Amino acid sequence: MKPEDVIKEQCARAKVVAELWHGFTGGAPKAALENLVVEFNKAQQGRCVRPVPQGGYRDLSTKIKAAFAAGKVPTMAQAFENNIALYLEAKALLPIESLGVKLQGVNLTFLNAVRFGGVVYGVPFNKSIQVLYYNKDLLKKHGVPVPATLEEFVAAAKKLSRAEGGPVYWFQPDASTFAYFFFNLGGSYLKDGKLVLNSKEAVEALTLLQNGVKEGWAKPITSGYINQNLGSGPYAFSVDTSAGYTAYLRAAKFDLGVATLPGRTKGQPGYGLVQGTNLVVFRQASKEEQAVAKDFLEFVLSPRAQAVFATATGYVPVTEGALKDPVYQAYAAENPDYATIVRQSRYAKFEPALAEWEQIRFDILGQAIKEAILNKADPKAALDRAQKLAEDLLS
Numbered sequence: 066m067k068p069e070d071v072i073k074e075q076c077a078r079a080k081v082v083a084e085l086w087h088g089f090t091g092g093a094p095k096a097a098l099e100n101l102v103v104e105f106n107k108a109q110q111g112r113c114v115r116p117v118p119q120g121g122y123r124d125l126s127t128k129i130k131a132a133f134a135a136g137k138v139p140t141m142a143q144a145f146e147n148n149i150a151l152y153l154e155a156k157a158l159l160p161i162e163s164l165g166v167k168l169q170g171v172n173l174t175f176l177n178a179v180r181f182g183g184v185v186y187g188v189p190f191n192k193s194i195q196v197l198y199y200n201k202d203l204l205k206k207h208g209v210p211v212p213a214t215l216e217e218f219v220a221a222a223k224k225l226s227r228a229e230g231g232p233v234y235w236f237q238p239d240a241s242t243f244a245y246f247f248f249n250l251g252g253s254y255l256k257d258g259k260l261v262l263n264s265k266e267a268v269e270a271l272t273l274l275q276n277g278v279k280e281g282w283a284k285p286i287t288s289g290y291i292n293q294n295l296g297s298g299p300y301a302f303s304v305d306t307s308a309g310y311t312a313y314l315r316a317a318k319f320d321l322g323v324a325t326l327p328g329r330t331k332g333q334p335g336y337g338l339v340q341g342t343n344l345v346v347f348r349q350a351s352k353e354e355q356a357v358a359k360d361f362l363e364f365v366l367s368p369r370a371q372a373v374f375a376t377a378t379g380y381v382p383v384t385e386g387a388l389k390d391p392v393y394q395a396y397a398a399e400n401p402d403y404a405t406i407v408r409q410s411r412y413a414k415f416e417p418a419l420a421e422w423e424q425i426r427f428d429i430l431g432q433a434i435k436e437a438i439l440n441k442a443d444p445k446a447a448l449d450r451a452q453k454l455a456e457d458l459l460s
């Protein structure tokens with residue numbers, strides 16, 4: 066009896082079913098969402114949430130695009146901030162506080178991100194931060210401390226790659242990985258209100274990655290997640306979402322480490338990219354569906370729900386109350402990596418919340434990074450093309 070089979074049975078016997086479209090394809094995130102929903106549905110008297118997998122997050126935004134074109138939206142969906150900005154152009158979203166969901170206690174890093182013209186339009190649900198994953202055994206073998214600075218990180222990657230005869234810093238050539246280097250080299254995506262993809266810091270960040278590939282210390286990962294590639298060649302480090310935590314733990318044959326990100330100096334950890342999603346509630350939903358959404362959103366924000374979901378996955382608990390929940394405290398007491406994730410979540414930056422950002426980050430910025438890393442494009446030339454395409458899209 067799979068959780069999704071139990072949910073099907075729950076919704077079949079329910080009088081009111083609120084659909085929740087999501088972008089979890091599998092692993093711990095999907096299981097954890099389905100377990101949270103089974104528990105919620107059990108407590109409700111014939112009022113249920115039906116999670117509907119729409120593929121990954123890009124497939125989900127496409128599926129919601131189609132739903133608007135069709136005139137039939139779900140009750141709830143996952144949404145990045147840029148997705149929220151786009152759904153707001155259509156006035157498609159209910160203000161959350163209008164349902165009477167209380168938001169006091171939600172981390173301001175996350176709550177600020179779903180506030181548009183002073184009004185909250187999403188509930189932070191599955192919010193991730195980048196962390197430094199590392200191979201404790203390989204660092205101990207070679208006497209290499211966990212790097213605290215970008216300088217130490219590069220030095221460590223070079224020393225270990227030479228010692229092991231393979232590039233030990235593994236990365237996906239994507240917008241998310243680029244953001245870590247860009248932000249910690251002093252980069253900002255907006256200058257005087259304008260999106261800029263081709264700033265000196267952007268070029269420096271993309272040049273550092275390309276040089277690491279050329280110099281034999283940085284390993285591009287082009288097929289699957291990093292954790293799905295472990296076992297093939299020496300691995301020391303990656304910068305990756307905390308939502309992958311339990312996938313790394315399951316895959317690693319070595320003693321997995323999690324550290325805060327390397328920063329410019331030891332005075333502060335590096336900034337990590339916030340990813341994962343918020344839940345939104347569509348205006349088109351019936352009063353009865355909207356009341357299910359209200360109850361489900363209070364449940365998602367409850368310390369126990371947050372504690373079980375964050376500890377199952379690596380997501381950052383979105384409320385102060387979650388950290389005080391005994392189930393959270395029990396996991397943290399046995400495993401210091403959960404506290405590491407929360408400490409890193411204090412040093413957190415977001416990409417721009419432009420409605421067009423999904424398209425820019427994958428089709429324009431992501432493509433420029435792939436051109437430079439995989440096809441040896443000149444970093445400034447690749448990012449100048451990106452800038453021109455983004456300027457053209459945003460005009």
Ligand SMILES: Nc1nc2c(ncn2[C@@H]2O[C@H](COP(=O)(O)O[C@H]3[C@@H](O)[C@H](n4ccc(=O)[nH]c4=O)O[C@@H]3CO)[C@H]3CC(O)(O)C[C@H]32)c(=O)[nH]1
Pocket residue numbers: 088089090092094122123126145147148191192193194239240241290292293306307308309310312340341342422423426
């Ligand atoms: N559509 C759209 N996507 C966006 C936007 N900003 C960022 N992202 C994507 O968020 C993913 C991070 O979201 P996060 O919830 O932290 O992590 C995901 C999965 O990454 C992660 N996962 C799953 C299996 C596994 O073996 N390892 C693992 O790490 O678990 C979660 C659920 O699938 C990145 C991935 C990306 O596709 O390169 C592009 C990124 C945006 O604006 N729009």
Ligand SMILES: O=[P-]([O-])[O-]
Pocket residue numbers: none
């Ligand atoms: O180094 P070769 O892949 O161009």
